[PDB]
Design a protein around this ligand. Structure first.
Ligand SMILES: [K+]
Length: 112
């Protein structure tokens, strides 16, 4: 079965993304739609160098049990990715932007 989709709903709705070089970015999010098979959230994060970015993210779990997401940004850009549970606290997120650029970050929910 793996990680239940609604596991993503718990705890404080804030986390940190850690990049390959150790850089960390804060993620603040708010769920706007919840159904047994699909979540949607508005996400805000401030990158290094101070740009503030907003995205709308749809999440679901495919029949192989993989948690997938599709993020859309105000400018029309999109990203498609997967979330893989590492331990109880952390997810591995790997995405591809519509320009072909890829990323890999870990996501950890801030402690309550
Ligand atoms: K944008």
């Amino acid at each position: 079965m793996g990680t239940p989709l609604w596991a993503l709903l718990g705890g404080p709705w804030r986390g940190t993304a850690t990049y390959e070089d150790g850089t960390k970015v804060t993620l603040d999010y708010r769920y706007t739609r919840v159904s047994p098979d699909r979540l949607r959230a508005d996400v805000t994060y401030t990158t290094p160098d101070g740009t503030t970015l907003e995205a709308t993210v749809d999440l679901w779990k495919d029949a192989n049990g993989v948690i997938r997401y599709h993020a859309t940004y105000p400018d029309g850009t999109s990203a498609d990715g997967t979330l893989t549970q590492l331990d109880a606290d952390t997810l591995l997120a790997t995405g591809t932007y519509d320009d072909g650029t890829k990323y890999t970050v870990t996501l950890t929910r801030v402690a309550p």
